[PDB]
Amino acid sequence: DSWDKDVYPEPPSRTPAPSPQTSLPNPITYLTKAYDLVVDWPVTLVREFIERQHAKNRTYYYHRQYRRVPDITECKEGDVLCIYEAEMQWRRDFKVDQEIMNIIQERLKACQQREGENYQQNCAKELEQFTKVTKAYQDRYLDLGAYYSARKCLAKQKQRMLEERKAARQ
Amino acid sequence: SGYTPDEKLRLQQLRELRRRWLKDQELSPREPVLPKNMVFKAYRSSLFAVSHVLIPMWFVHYYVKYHMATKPYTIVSSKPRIFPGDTILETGEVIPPMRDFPDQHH
Amino acid sequence: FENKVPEKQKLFQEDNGMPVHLKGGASDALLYRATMALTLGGTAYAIYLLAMAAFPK
Amino acid sequence: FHMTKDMLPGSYPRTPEERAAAAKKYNMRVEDYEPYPDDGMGYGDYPMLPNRSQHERDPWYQWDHSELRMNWGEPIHWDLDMYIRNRVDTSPTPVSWDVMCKHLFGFVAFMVFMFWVGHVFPSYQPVGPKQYPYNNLYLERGGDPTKEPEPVVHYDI
Amino acid sequence: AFCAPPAYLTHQQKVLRLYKRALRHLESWCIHRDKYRYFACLMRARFEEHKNEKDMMRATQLLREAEEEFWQNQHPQPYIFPDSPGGTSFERYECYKVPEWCLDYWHPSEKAMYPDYFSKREQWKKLRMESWDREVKQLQEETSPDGIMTEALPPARREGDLPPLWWHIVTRPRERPT
Amino acid sequence: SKYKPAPLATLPSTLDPAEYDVSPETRRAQVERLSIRARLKREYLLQYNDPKRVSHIEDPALIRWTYARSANIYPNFRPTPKNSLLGAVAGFGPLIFWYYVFKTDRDRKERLIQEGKLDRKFNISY
Amino acid sequence: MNIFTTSILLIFILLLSPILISMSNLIKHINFPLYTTTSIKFSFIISLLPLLMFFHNNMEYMITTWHWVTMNSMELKMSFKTDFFSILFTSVALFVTWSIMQFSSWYMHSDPNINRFIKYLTLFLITMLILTSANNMFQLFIGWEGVGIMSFLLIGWWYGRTDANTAALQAILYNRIGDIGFILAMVWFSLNMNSWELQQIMFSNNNDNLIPLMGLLIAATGKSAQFGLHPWLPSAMEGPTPVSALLHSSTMVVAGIFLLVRFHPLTTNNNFILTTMLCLGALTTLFTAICALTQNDIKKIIAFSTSSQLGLMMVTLGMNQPHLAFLHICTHAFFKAMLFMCSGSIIHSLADEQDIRKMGNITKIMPFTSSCLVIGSLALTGMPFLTGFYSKDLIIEAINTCNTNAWALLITLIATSMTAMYSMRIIYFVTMTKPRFPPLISINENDPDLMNPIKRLAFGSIFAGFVISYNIPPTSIPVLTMPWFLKTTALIISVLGFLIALELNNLTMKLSMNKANPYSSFSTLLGFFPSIIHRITPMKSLNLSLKTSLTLLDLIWLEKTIPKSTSTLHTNMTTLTTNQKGLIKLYFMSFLINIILIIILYSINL
Ligand SMILES: CCCCCCCCCCCCCCCCCC(=O)OC[C@H](COP(=O)(O)OCCN)OC(=O)CCCCCCCCCCCCCCCCC
Ligand SMILES: CCCCCCCCCCCCCCCCCC(=O)OC[C@H](COP(=O)(O)OCCN)OC(=O)CCCCCCCCCCCCCCCCC
């Protein structure tokens, strides 16, 4: 498994012990034992064959990282070089934030499906996290337009700072 | 009124040519000129199950384990029902029972 | 209020074999059916109630 | 092809000679041919065929255009693409159109009125509300665990 | 279907059409066979007792009154035969009545799949050519220079001749082609 | 107790009063109507049953109907008060009405966003 | 956790297999209808397996098989929400489709496109299973539209029939109005909760959802053919009988009701929505039963029976009882598949004779089909301890003993009594009295491909409600402490409906003609809704189109306004500027006044 519980949290499963009160056999258990023996064994055998071929031909790939160029706040206007660099940085951070919101939404969906009819109570922390990241995303990225830009985001953030500063006066 | 003699003679000629056309619509015995059964349970219901069911089962079970469970939130299920008096297989505690049921009328 | 008795009379001398208490069409047939189902349905309710009074709880 | 302006449709007819020429062009009799009124809607000399759909035509007749139920060379209605058999029907009905409108509107209005009557006079059972424990399920409906709700207390009877 | 309608319907034709339509709506109302037979005998008696009319203006008035009564008392959903227009099975196999001229456009492989049938088809086409020339001459001769003209067609008036415009009647597709 | 027709429910040809009061002029009018119908049917039947025909039968009725419905309208159009009023209302009135409803809706939305009484729940992708 | 997903995806793969076989150029060598029938029965077994698994552990499943596209915070993934509704409807639909496929293999013989017919039926089953098991609203809409288009094709199967083409087009129209409602709901959900995901819908339960529930109600009305959008289903009976059965009896008709069952947690928090669904369902079941009392085509009668029971389900969703509605969905699928299949056997052996006025003596002449028709009719009316007793009776119990509309209650009871009445009309005019068919006897119902599916559907219509209802996990607590006139109400109204319609049929047997009345005219002419609406709406729409849009704007007024006015202005001005006389005296006069004008303009400019 390529995923981890640090970013995809999951409570441990608590299955109950089987207690057959009736004397009839369980067709579910009979069919799953037969299905295991006829299907799961050849599938896992060919999978270990494929994985040992992978181990014979093992290759590695790396996750690319980008250093932090100075932001658009210290970019002179009209100097399109640093503005372009900061704009590409802003676009990359925008895509990262989009995938962050996707991760949070997937976590919320998993919480709801896992809890079922207890989702109103047990998913309070997940819904609170979704609400917080939703409010932050709305405050940083909403209403930018189709041509969203680092300059437009900076203008929106400056307007928000001015209005909250005027609200902080009284 | 009935048939005029113009239409009466015409129709019998059109009907007569209609029988000739429909007779020609028949096929000669050579038409068209084209260029291990066992029983149903032993054979007919057997190879279908091992080809159209068993082989696609292998490909599906390959996909749902080595390409679905390896993904984070593909197969997510609700928690199973836990009643008092049950024992958890994973952790190992016993859920305590209920109270005394003061009403035992029925 | 006009006179429609003589037209209503000729809806009562049809020699079709339909009796006098059903000769008024289908409406009196439905009234017949409803009163036949509800006197008997009342009667079975009365006999059941008399039996329930005769055999107390 | 061989289609020319003299038998192609043209301007609005004024003289009786021009009306007769238009009728001959459209393969109609002079008295049967009647153009649209000259109100400048672009109809021209095209005849005012009666506004009847193609369902009125005899279905047992072997029409030249069997789907359209029309012959060959007879004038085409201006609204044939309305009056084809896949579309608007003008056929006579066993009951009158005003009678159908009145009955349908009366049924709809009657049902609406009695639904309002049943809404203002609802029917129920001689019971109280549904009894629920734990402050009417405060925690399970998504209540705040920190904020203590008003104690909803229920009693036996 | 096989006979073209005339210019106008005669009074006798209209009376017979009304009689047949009234009997059809009578059986649609009656459903049961004995009831239909009784009321059909009654309607036949009504037509018979209005049959011997001499004024003919009162006969047209009686026809108009009978049409008004029929339109008032007609069944909203009358019985229709499945092959009749408006029926359930009407025009059902028009998707299967393929015209005969695609057999010309068939490939030589599909030509060789049915040899004897295509030989008979070629014989029919040759007969069609010769009879077409002869019947064009016949229809040119038979047409009146002026006067009244009906949709009916003349027959073949000499030996070895086919009736004019016979092709779309003789070679029409079967009503149950499959 | 009389059938009342409509443009969408026409009166039956067996119930019209124009047939029972029939005249010799009307009878002969139907006679030449049948004559023209038969002449056109004969011409189409000859063209249909010609075996030397290698193409579709052209239809002058279809050609005339298509030209009347496509190309004759602007040559035969004359501006009147009535069609000018109808064209003006049918080209402007819906536009003005939809402009007014959209402007009030968007003004209400923008004012509610500005002074804060409209809360966006999870609108993050607009 | 692997066998379950493997079984679901194997159901989908076994459904997809005959389509690839049809495109794989070996249909000319194999027996395609038998092959597809075996595929459907194996899919039914592999759907019976998770039915047993869910009956054991009651686990709710969500399987995200493929990731389609990711666009910012909206991530469209192909997922299946395998629930109680999904599993039970998959099993019921697969069993019904197995029966209908075997029946159609018997029925549509001497038809060269039988392989295309079976392929179309299989494609419809694939789209219906996609719609049933879909997890997000985009896949829900994929299944919805696949259902709609396959219904279009299967109604217009006989493309040489103008009536069939017209009925298919109007089915497309009413389904498209439902699609507009569904699109409104989908758009609102994407705008407000960033996803079409049902888990986020569950998290959307806690606010005002009036607009998306109104859109879902419009979608359900359009799909299930309620009042206002009803007549496309009796029009949709124009196609073949197996199409009528499978399409418009078991699967398509319950799709909007299934959608509202899916959105029942949102539905439970909106009293306005619950009240208007209760009213709409009661009105449509009363209206459709009213039509069915005097319909004479047997397929039309059972179509209106289907629509009236859909109104009953619509009422059942009108209260907070979605699981009862789904139970009635299963029982109704069984009943109408069986009834339609029996009527199709009647029609085929009576040589395409479809109306009940040319039938009779069917009890003596077709004992098997008469027995099964009686079984289906009794189970539809609510004969106790049959399959319909475990849903219809509880629906009657809930409407009698919960706080709802009084008029809706009254017309629902009247609709149930009239359901018994029109089932009596079917039984009388088909299975009873004297024969009325043409004399030539062509009855042969001894073919096994006809005989076996009716047996299987009879076993279903006897035992399926029993087995399912005692395997249902206990949800939506019913009430039981109630007096007798509310308890046996369904039995009393069914019995009196049977007896009233029996007496009325005896009156029709009695030798007397009666004057027709506007009540029977209204019922026979479908409430005048098809004639009136289907004439007044297309005529005004197409008249507005041609006589305003095309003509008045494009061919007249835009053409007069921009291009021809520009051309007229330039032509008039070029005539004015080139209307020269060619006289050098006038030219030099022009030059002189040009010189004078230049002097004056220079003098005033300075
Ligand atoms: C208690 C509360 C009660 C509330 C009640 C509410 C009622 C709401 C009703 C909403 C829908 C009303 C309009 C429905 C129009 C349906 C038209 C239709 O189906 O036409 C089909 C018709 C042919 O059908 P027909 O002749 O009947 O059958 C064949 C018999 N030989 O004709 C044709 O096939 C002609 C071909 C089509 C022509 C073009 C049609 C375009 C329509 C565009 C409509 C745009 C606006 C839609 C608005 C929807 C609003 C919901
Ligand atoms: C809702 C939006 C509203 C706002 C947008 C409105 C504008 C939309 C775009 C404008 C479109 C204009 C189209 C002009 C071409 C159409 C007219 C045309 O082609 O007329 C043909 C006619 C000559 O006909 P001809 O072919 O010789 O004869 C028929 C067969 N022999 O031609 C003539 O008789 C003369 C044609 C003259 C040339 C026309 C093209 C050039 C026009 C130049 C306009 C200059 C305007 C500014 C002038 C100065 C300020 C007043």
DSSP notation for G49-72: HHHHHHHHH---EEEEEEEEEEET
Residues of chain G with Cβ-Cβ distance to A124 below 8 Å are none
Taking alpha carbons only, the member of G60, F18, F59 closest to residue D80 is: F59
Q: Ligand 1 centre from F111 Cα, in Å?
A: 39
- In whole angstroms, what separates CA B81 from the centre of its chain? 33
Question: What separation in angstroms does the CA of G278 have from each of C45, D115, D121, G226, G323?
Answer: 35, 10, 15, 12, 16
3-class state of residue B87 by DSSP:
strand
**Is the CB of residue F53 less than 8 Å away from at least one CB of chain E?**
no
**Is the CB of residue E166 less than 8 Å away from at least one CB of chain G?**
no
- The set of residues, in sequence order, having a beta carbon less than 8 Å from that of G104 and lying 6+ positions away, is G33, G117, G118, G121, G240, G242
To the nearest whole Å, the CA of A122 is away from the closest chain D CA by 8
Contact G310, G253 (CB under 8 A): yes
Contact D33, F33 (CB under 8 A): no
Contact G249, G333 (CB under 8 A): yes
Interface contact flag, E1 D94, Cβ < 8 Å:
no
How far is Cα E19 from Cα A54, in angstroms, rounded to an integer? Answer: 90
Contact G95, G44 (CB under 8 A): yes
Ligand 1 is surrounded, with C-beta below 6 A, by D 87, 89, 111-112; G 163, 166, 169-170, 173, 177, 227-228, 235, 283, 530, 533-534, 537-538, 541-542
Residue A78's region, left for phi above 0, alpha for psi from -120 to 50, else beta, is left
| Length of chain G counted residue by residue | 606
How far is Cα G192 from Cα G190, in angstroms, rounded to an integer? Answer: 6
Residues of chain E with Cβ-Cβ distance to G516 below 8 Å are 73, 76
Q: How many CB pairs below 8 Å do chains B and G form together?
A: 62
Percent helix / strand / coil, chain A, rounded to 5: 65, 0, 30
Interface contact flag, E151 F46, Cβ < 8 Å:
no
Interface contact flag, C18 G512, Cβ < 8 Å:
yes
Taking alpha carbons only, the member of G27, G47, G44, G244 closest to residue G119 is: G27
Question: What separation in angstroms does the CA of G453 have from each of D136, G34, G94, G273, G304?
Answer: 51, 13, 13, 40, 24
Dihedral angle at the C-alpha atoms of G562, G564, G566, G570, nearest 10 degrees?
Answer: 180
The ligand minimizing its distance to the Cα of F91 is: 2
How far is Cα G161 from Cα G239, in angstroms, rounded to an integer? Answer: 10
- Tally Cβ neighbours within 10 Å of residue G453: 25
How far is Cα G325 from Cα G258, in angstroms, rounded to an integer? Answer: 9
Q: Ligand 2 centre from G578 Cα, in Å?
A: 19
**Is the CB of residue G166 less than 8 Å away from at least one CB of chain D?**
yes
- Tally Cβ neighbours within 10 Å of residue D145: 9
Interface contact flag, F8 G536, Cβ < 8 Å:
yes
Contact G258, G326 (CB under 8 A): yes
How far is Cα G49 from Cα G90, in angstroms, rounded to an integer? Answer: 11
Instruction: Note which residues in 134-163 of chain A have CB less than 8 A from chain G.
Output: 137
- The set of residues, in sequence order, having a beta carbon less than 8 Å from that of G526 and lying 6+ positions away, is G231, G234, G291
Residue nearest to atom 18 of ligand 2 (CA): G567
Contact E139, E164 (CB under 8 A): yes
DSSP assignment of D35-79, as one string?
Answer: BPPSSSSS-TT-B------TTSS-TTS--SBTTTTB-SSSPPPTT
Give the largest CA-CA distance in chain E. Answer: 72
Taking alpha carbons only, the member of G504, G418, A77, A144 closest to residue C27 is: G504
Q: What are phi and psi of B72, to 5 degrees?
A: -65, -60
How far is Cα F72 from Cα D10, in angstroms, rounded to an integer? Answer: 7
Contact E32, G434 (CB under 8 A): yes
| G231 exposure class (CB count in 10 Å sphere: 0-12, 13-18, 19+) | buried
Ligand 2 is surrounded, with C-beta below 6 A, by G 562-563, 566-567, 570-571
Where helices occur in G23-136 by DSSP H, the ranges are 32-57, 84-107, 114-133
Q: Ligand 1 centre from G533 Cα, in Å?
A: 6
Question: What separation in angstroms does the CA of A56 have from each of A44, A49, A52, G362?
Answer: 18, 11, 6, 75
DSSP assignment of G545-598, as one string?
Answer: IIIIIIIIIIIIIHHHHTHHHHHHHHHHHHHHHT-----HHHHHHHHHHHHHHH
- The set of residues, in sequence order, having a beta carbon less than 8 Å from that of A158 and lying 6+ positions away, is none
Query: Which residue reads 């159901």 in tokens?
Result: G11
Choice from G566, G573, G574 to test ligand 2 binding pocket (greatest atom count within 8 A of CB): G566
Taking alpha carbons only, the member of F65, G564, F85 closest to residue D43 is: F65
Tokens of G539: 């005529």
Element (H, E) at A107: helix A80-115
Taking alpha carbons only, the member of A157, A154, A126 closest to residue A139 is: A157
Contact D67, D38 (CB under 8 A): no
Question: What separation in angstroms does the CA of A34 have from each of A41, D26, G12, G566?
Answer: 11, 82, 22, 84
Contact D63, D69 (CB under 8 A): yes
How far is Cα D49 from Cα D33, in angstroms, rounded to an integer? Answer: 8
DSSP assignment of G290-356, as one string?
Answer: HHHHH--BHHHHHHHHHHHHHHHHHHHHHTT-HHHHHHHHHHHHHHHHHHHHHHHHHHHHTTS--BG
Residues of D near A (Cβ–Cβ under 8 Å) read 139-142
Query: Which residue reads 């799949």 in tokens?
Result: E113
Strand G61-71 versus strand B75-77 pairing type: antiparallel
Q: How many CB pairs below 8 Å do chains A and D form together?
A: 9
Question: What separation in angstroms does the CA of G166 have from each of G157, G232, G246?
Answer: 12, 10, 21
Instruction: Note which residues in 17-36 of chain B have CB less than 8 A from chain E.
Output: 17-18, 21-22, 24-25, 27-28, 30-34
Residues of chain F with Cβ-Cβ distance to D100 below 8 Å are 9
Angle, vertex CA D5, rays to CA D3 and CA D10, nearest 5: 125
Instruction: HSE, CB side, 13 Å, CA atoms: give it for residue G389.
Output: 13
Tokens of G106: 């018997």
**Chains near G (3 or more Cβ pairs under 8 Å):** A, B, C, D, E, F
Where helices occur in chain E by DSSP H, the ranges are 11-30, 33-49, 57-73, 108-113, 115-142, 167-170
| G574 exposure class (CB count in 10 Å sphere: 0-12, 13-18, 19+) | exposed
- The set of residues, in sequence order, having a beta carbon less than 8 Å from that of A111 and lying 6+ positions away, is A119, A122, A123, A126, A127, G199
Query: Which residue reads 């009466």 in tokens?
Result: B8
Tokens of E167: 């092709």
Question: What separation in angstroms does the CA of G292 have from each of A69, B91, D108, G287?
Answer: 76, 61, 18, 9
Contact G211, G77 (CB under 8 A): no
Ligand 1 atom nearest G173 alpha carbon: 19
- Tally Cβ neighbours within 10 Å of residue D46: 25
Q: Ligand 1 centre from G176 Cα, in Å?
A: 11
Q: Which amino acid is at G9?
A: L
Nearest CA in chain G to A103: G73
- The set of residues, in sequence order, having a beta carbon less than 8 Å from that of G34 and lying 6+ positions away, is G105
How far is Cα B7 from Cα E153, in angstroms, rounded to an integer? Answer: 7
Q: How many CB pairs below 8 Å do chains D and G form together?
A: 94
To the nearest whole Å, the CA of G126 is away from the closest chain D CA by 30
Interface contact flag, A102 G199, Cβ < 8 Å:
no
Which of F9, F37, F74 lies nearest to residue D92, judging by beta carbons?
F9
**Is the CB of residue G172 less than 8 Å away from at least one CB of chain D?**
no
- The set of residues, in sequence order, having a beta carbon less than 8 Å from that of G115 and lying 6+ positions away, is G22, G27, G32, G33
Q: What is the DSSP letter of B88?
A: B
Taking alpha carbons only, the member of G391, G138, G145 closest to residue G255 is: G145
- Tally Cβ neighbours within 10 Å of residue G111: 16
How far is Cα E19 from Cα E42, in angstroms, rounded to an integer? Answer: 12
Residues of chain G with Cβ-Cβ distance to B65 below 8 Å are 2
Contact G209, G191 (CB under 8 A): no
How far is Cα G50 from Cα B77, in angstroms, rounded to an integer? Answer: 14
- Tally Cβ neighbours within 10 Å of residue G61: 24
Taking alpha carbons only, the member of A109, A134, A137, A112 closest to residue A123 is: A112
Number of H helices, E strands in chain G: 27, 2
Q: What are phi and psi of G340, to 5 degrees?
A: -65, -40
How far is Cα A163 from Cα B13, in angstroms, rounded to an integer? Answer: 100
Contact D42, G555 (CB under 8 A): yes
- The set of residues, in sequence order, having a beta carbon less than 8 Å from that of D57 and lying 6+ positions away, is D63, D69, D70
DSSP assignment of A73-104, as one string?
Answer: GGSPTT-HHHHHHHHHHHHHHHHHHHHHHHHH
Query: Which residue reads 């704009």 in tokens?
Result: A87
How far is Cα C24 from Cα G495, in angstroms, rounded to an integer? Answer: 26
- In whole angstroms, what separates CA B49 from the centre of its chain? 13
| B40 exposure class (CB count in 10 Å sphere: 0-12, 13-18, 19+) | exposed
How far is Cα G576 from Cα G595, in angstroms, rounded to an integer? Answer: 22
Q: Ligand 2 centre from G554 Cα, in Å?
A: 16
What pairs with residue G404 in β-bridges? D123
How far is Cα G597 from Cα E90, in angstroms, rounded to an integer? Answer: 86
Selected for mutation to probe chain G from E27, E30, E83, E88 (highest G CB count within 10 Å) is E88
- The set of residues, in sequence order, having a beta carbon less than 8 Å from that of G137 and lying 6+ positions away, is G185, G186, G189, G196
How far is Cα F26 from Cα G594, in angstroms, rounded to an integer? Answer: 76
Percent helix / strand / coil, chain C, rounded to 5: 65, 0, 35
Nearest CA in chain B to G43: B53
- The set of residues, in sequence order, having a beta carbon less than 8 Å from that of G280 and lying 6+ positions away, is G217, G221, G226, G227, G314, G318
- The set of residues, in sequence order, having a beta carbon less than 8 Å from that of G298 and lying 6+ positions away, is G343, G346, G347, G354, G355, G356, G359, G426, G430
What pairs with residue G297 in β-bridges? G355
Q: What are phi and psi of E64, to 5 degrees?
A: -65, -40
| B22 exposure class (CB count in 10 Å sphere: 0-12, 13-18, 19+) | exposed
Contact G188, F122 (CB under 8 A): no
| Cis peptide bond N-terminal to B32, omega within 30 | yes
Q: What are phi and psi of G511, to 5 degrees?
A: -80, 90
